[PDB]
Amino acid sequence: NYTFIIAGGGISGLTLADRLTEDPRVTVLVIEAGPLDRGEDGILVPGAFSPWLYFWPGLVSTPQAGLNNRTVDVITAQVVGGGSTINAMVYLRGDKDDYDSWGALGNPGWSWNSMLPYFIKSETFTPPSPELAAAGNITWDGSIRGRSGPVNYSYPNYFFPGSENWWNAANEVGLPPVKDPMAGSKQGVFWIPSAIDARTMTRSHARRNHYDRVSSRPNYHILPSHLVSKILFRGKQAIGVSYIPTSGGNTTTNVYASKEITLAAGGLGTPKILQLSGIGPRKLLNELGIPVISDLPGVGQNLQDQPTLTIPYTFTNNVFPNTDSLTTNATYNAEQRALYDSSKQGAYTIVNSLSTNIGVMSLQRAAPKSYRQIIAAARARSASLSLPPGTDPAVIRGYQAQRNAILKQFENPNVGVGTVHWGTGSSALVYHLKPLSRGTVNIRSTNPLDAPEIDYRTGTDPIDAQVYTSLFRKNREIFNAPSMRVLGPSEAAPFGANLTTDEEIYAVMRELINPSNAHQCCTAAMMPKDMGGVVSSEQKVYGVQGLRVADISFWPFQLSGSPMATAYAGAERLADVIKKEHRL
Ligand SMILES: Cc1cc2c(cc1C)N(C[C@H](O)[C@H](O)[C@H](O)COP(=O)(O)OP(=O)(O)OC[C@H]1O[C@@H](n3cnc4c(N)ncnc43)[C@H](O)[C@@H]1O)c1[nH]c(=O)[nH]c(=O)c1N2
Ligand SMILES: CCn1/c(=N/N=c2\sc3cc(S(=O)(=O)O)ccc3n2CC)sc2cc(S(=O)(=O)O)ccc21
Ligand SMILES: *[C@@H]1O[C@H](CO)[C@@H](O[C@@H]2O[C@H](CO)[C@@H](O)[C@H](O)[C@H]2NC(C)=O)[C@H](O)[C@H]1NC(C)=O
Ligand SMILES: *[C@@H]1O[C@H](CO)[C@@H](O)[C@H](O)[C@H]1NC(C)=O
Ligand SMILES: *[C@@H]1O[C@H](CO)[C@@H](O)[C@H](O)[C@H]1NC(C)=O
Ligand SMILES: *[C@@H]1O[C@H](CO)[C@@H](O)[C@H](O)[C@H]1NC(C)=O
Ligand SMILES: *[C@@H]1O[C@H](CO)[C@@H](O)[C@H](O)[C@H]1NC(C)=O
Numbered sequence: 001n002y003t004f005i006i007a008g009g010g011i012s013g014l015t016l017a018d019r020l021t022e023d024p025r026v027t028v029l030v031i032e033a034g035p036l037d038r039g040e041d042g043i044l045v046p047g048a049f050s051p052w053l054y055f056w057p058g059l060v061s062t063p064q065a066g067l068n069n070r071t072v073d074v075i076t077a078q079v080v081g082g083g084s085t086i087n088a089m090v091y092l093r094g095d096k097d098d099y100d101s102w103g104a105l106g107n108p109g110w111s112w113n114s115m116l117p118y119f120i121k122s123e124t125f126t127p128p129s130p131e132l133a134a135a136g137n138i139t140w141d142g143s144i145r146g147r148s149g150p151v152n153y154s155y156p157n158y159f160f161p162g163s164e165n166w167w168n169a170a171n172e173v174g175l176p177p178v179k180d181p182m183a184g185s186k187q188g189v190f191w192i193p194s195a196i197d198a199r200t201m202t203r204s205h206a207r208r209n210h211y212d213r214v215s216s217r218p219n220y221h222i223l224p225s226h227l228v229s230k231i232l233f234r235g236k237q238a239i240g241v242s243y244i245p246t247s248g249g250n251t252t253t254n255v256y257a258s259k260e261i262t263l264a265a266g267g268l269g270t271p272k273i274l275q276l277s278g279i280g281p282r283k284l285l286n287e288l289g290i291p292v293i294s295d296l297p298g299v300g301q302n303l304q305d306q307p308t309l310t311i312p313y314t315f316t317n318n319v320f321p322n323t324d325s326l327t328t329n330a331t332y333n334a335e336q337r338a339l340y341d342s343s344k345q346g347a348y349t350i351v352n353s354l355s356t357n358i359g360v361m362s363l364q365r366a367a368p369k370s371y372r373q374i375i376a377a378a379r380a381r382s383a384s385l386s387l388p389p390g391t392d393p394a395v396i397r398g399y400q401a402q403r404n405a406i407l408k409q410f411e412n413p414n415v416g417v418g419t420v421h422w423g424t425g426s427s428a429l430v431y432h433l434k435p436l437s438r439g440t441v442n443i444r445s446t447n448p449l450d451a452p453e454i455d456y457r458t459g460t461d462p463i464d465a466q467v468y469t470s471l472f473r474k475n476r477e478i479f480n481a482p483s484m485r486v487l488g489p490s491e492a493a494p495f496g497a498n499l500t501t502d503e504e505i506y507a508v509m510r511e512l513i514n515p516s517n518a519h520q521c522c523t524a525a526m527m528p529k530d531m532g533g534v535v536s537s538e539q540k541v542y543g544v545q546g547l548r549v550a551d552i553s554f555w556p557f558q559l560s561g562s563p564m565a566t567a568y569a570g571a572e573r574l575a576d577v578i579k580k581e582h583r584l
């Protein structure tokens with residue numbers, strides 16, 4: 001018997017387990033599908049980045065109707081630490097109105113103001129050296145970055161010279177320097193905060209900062225390489241879980257909690273635990289013979305990610321060195337690795353293929369001459385057209401509320417809808433942060449070893465292509481600006497300066513967009529039950545007691561930014577919520 005059982009030892013689950021076990025009278029068992037990492041260089045060393053070491057095996061999408069019926073491999077972590085163990089270490093908060101919007105969907109206690117203290121509590125910022133801050137244009141607001149919390153973050157101690165050309169080009173096309181992208185707005189260019197521990201220039205993943213740091217505690221239990229296969233109930237009270245070996249041996253074990261079960265199994269894991277447990281849409285559960293404990297049509301609905309596009313380039317005059325020097329110049333690569341091994345300096349402090357700066361933009365910043373035409377098209381179109389006919393009416397109502405919030409964001413000069421990056425080598429990246437499209441993740445069987453059906457539904461809402469085409473065009477402005485023209489860039493096939501119309505551009509984007517950056521969210525959404533929600537503002541699953549969702553399944557919709565910083569802070573927040581109820 002334990003006080004709490006947590007299903008999934010990723011960012012959210014380890015953060016919560018750490019905080020709960022600060023009380024020696026509280027025992028927690030974290031059951032995690034994947035193993036402990038081995039401190040491999042591909043995990044700890046940014047320049048050695050090997051995220052494939054711990055991908056969840058055997059996940060594939062359905063044919064994507066919005067992307068020429070392409071099927072894609074599905075990327076998500078299977079390891080203690082979850083996504084933090086294998087992600088690109090990009091550490092960014094959302095914008096103020098993300099959290100304010102979640103509140104306004106009917107979630108008391110949710111706002112930028114209520115999240116800020118948890119962002120600060122989550123982390124310790126280590127400032128860069130003064131010379132690098134000056135040379136690099138690295139700025140921050142120390143008043144809103146944490147100084148005492150467990151997640152270490154800082155910056156690489158080096159930048160590739162081409163990053164200077166790109167910064168100045170971005171400024172030339174209306175992306176100015178941002179004082180601090182952690183301050184609730186990020187309109188322009190800034191250094192990428194990185195979840196690195198500057199004492200060793202190694203990854204600060206949740207395994208380290210929310211397990212190893214406190215692993216002397218006897219009340220903090222971990223069971224790697226096991227799957228939570230089912231929640232156990234006494235009436236409507238969640239009292240325990242069943243678990244099985246991840247490797248598929250015909251063993252099943254029950255373990256019980258005295259206070260609560262917490263799901264932390266991620267956007268693609270949490271809904272499957274709920275549905276196998278009889279918490280989910282009665283149509284699906286009836287088809288599979290699963291007895292209904294709580295009829296929640298929102299479970300597995302509302303899937304979101306943040307699509308990506310890689311644009312290939314050739315250069316007549318690129319500057320040396322650059323990220324591609326690591327792969328095409330054995331001498332350079334060896335010298336940089338030796339430099340890192342000796343004094344922890346140089347290119348190996350940057351995640352492999354990343355540069356050091358990035359840019360974020362609102363819809364009006366991307367599309368100053370046409371954003372009102374995009375907003376009009378989106379306003380004109382019934383929210384129901386984005387979902388299959390016969391979608392549960394409560395789920396449609398919640399989608400319409402999300403959509404109305406996002407259209408306000410499209411009007412807001414201080415909320416981002418897209419990200420631009422250049423690694424300094426042969427490609428650029430353009431990310432779509434705020435899709436209106438919604439996907440699904442549903443079990444196909446009662447067998448807990450079976451992958452769910454994963455349908456991103458990328459590009460099914462036609463507004464998304466209008467936003468994404470605008471982001472593409474802004475990226476093209478950067479590469480055509482004076483400070484980048486000196487390097488002699490040109491788009492390579494299948495892009496090219498000869499694609500000038502929205503139709504010509506998007507035809508290629510439809511063939512190249514990746515549905516996912518492994519940012520899967522929002523499949524157990526925090527909205528009122530009558531809006532298709534799965535959890536309350538206190539993250540309690542509707543219709544049962546003693547059961548919460550901690551992982552980013554609970555988010556209503558995607559942020560202006562990537563999820564990691566908010567995955568940590570939301571778990572810090574929930575730990576205090578749980579402590580308040582049980583007087584811990
Ligand atoms: C390769 C890659 C790259 C990036 C990113 C991810 C990935 C995989 N992300 C996304 C970010 O890392 C991600 O959104 C968060 O880790 C989500 O945290 P959660 O706690 O929701 O899930 P998370 O995925 O962290 O943890 C879920 C855990 O549950 C486990 N699990 C699932 N089913 C289970 C079951 N039935 N029983 C037990 N355990 C189960 C999984 O094994 C996993 O460890 C990212 N974000 C960002 O901000 N910056 C970035 O640079 C990147 N880059
Ligand atoms: C560094 C760039 N980058 C990513 N690369 N992903 C990579 S790199 C990579 C190389 C190999 S290889 O070595 O076999 O070729 C295989 C798979 C890889 N993957 C797939 C996971 S994921 C990401 C997210 C964010 S965000 O979260 O901030 O948006 C920002 C930047 C990101
Ligand atoms: C990562 O953050 C932690 C927490 O703020 C740092 O740990 C503190 O470090 C100081 C100086 O070494 C110690 O005196 C404190 O006792 C530590 N506190 C805790 C709670 O651990 C660590 O220093 C950080 N890494 C860097 C590079 O600053
Ligand atoms: C995708 O497949 C459907 C069949 O389900 C077909 O009707 C449609 O034409 C296909 N789309 C493309 C672009 O090939
Ligand atoms: C920093 O900003 C200044 C002023 O715009 C510019 O001259 C310089 O090239 C920039 N350097 C980098 C590395 O971004
Ligand atoms: C698992 O074990 C039980 C009890 O021995 C048995 O009834 C069942 O056939 C086994 N299943 C598999 C997949 O081997
Ligand atoms: C390879 O890198 C080395 C070490 O920095 C440098 O001296 C050399 O000029 C590079 N070679 C090419 C062809 O860029």
Ligand SMILES: *[C@@H]1O[C@H](CO)[C@@H](O)[C@H](O)[C@H]1NC(C)=O
Nearest residue numbers: 491492493494495496497498
């Ligand atoms: C357009 O440019 C691309 C990119 O270099 C090239 O592949 C193609 O030859 C050009 N297209 C036509 C129709 O001439």
Ligand SMILES: [Cl-]
Nearest residue numbers: 035036224225
């Ligand atoms: Cl292990």
Ligand SMILES: [Mg+2]
Nearest residue numbers: 127128129130
């Ligand atoms: Mg210093």
Ligand SMILES: [Mg+2]
Nearest residue numbers: 340341342343
């Ligand atoms: Mg050494």
